[PDB]
């Protein structure tokens, strides 16, 4: 949602309206309340795009923690956005080593959620806490309560 809600912030009302209707007819031949392969393919072969039932349902699995289970209007649109050339690819690992390192205020190579949340206080803006512990888990896939550089990487996904 983080990436996703932050995204819906940008594009305006009319973008929202056009893809709502684009779903209202993306169900012109719908499948599952979500969109299983028939409408997806329908709309695509109307032009020629290539989503496959398998990876359809998989990128769904990547996202259907909501309980869409298959390509809902949400997945229809995340597919939509999964194509437009806008941005990706990860502020420098050298940069990121620095960024870890300042998370590694301690000058160690291992960071608990404490000086990390203190980096966050150093960010100051309205601090969420759920997402703080979530980010602890993101990083500490090592799960050692303290976080290394690549854990920090696992902790700062999709970030500028």
């Amino acid at each position: 949602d983080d990436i996703y809600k932050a995204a819906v912030e940008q594009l305006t009302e009319e973008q929202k309206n056009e893809f709502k209707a684009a779903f209202d007819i993306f169900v012109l031949g719908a499948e599952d309340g979500c969109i299983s392969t028939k409408e997806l393919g329908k709309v695509m072969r109307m032009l020629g795009q290539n989503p496959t039932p398998e990876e359809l349902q998989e990128m769904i699995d990547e996202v259907d923690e909501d309980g869409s289970g298959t390509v809902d209007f949400d997945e229809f649109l995340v597919m939509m956005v999964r194509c437009m050339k806008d941005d990706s690819k990860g502020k420098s690992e050298e940069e990121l080593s620095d960024l870890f390192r300042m998370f590694d205020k301690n000058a160690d190579g291992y960071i608990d959620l404490d000086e990390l949340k203190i980096m966050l206080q150093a960010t100051g803006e309205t601090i969420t806490e759920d997402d703080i512990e979530e980010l602890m888990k993101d990083g500490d896939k090592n799960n050692d309560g303290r976080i290394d550089y690549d854990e920090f990487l696992e902790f700062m996904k999709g970030v500028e």
């Binding site: 594009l11 305006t12 009319e14 973008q15 929202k16 309206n17 056009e18 109307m46 032009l47």
Partner: peptide, 12 residues
């Protein structure tokens, strides 16, 4: 976008 949206594509 063009070939199947035409001049209707202005803001959205």
């Amino acid at each position: 976008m063009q070939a199947l949206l035409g001049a209707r594509a202005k803001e959205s």
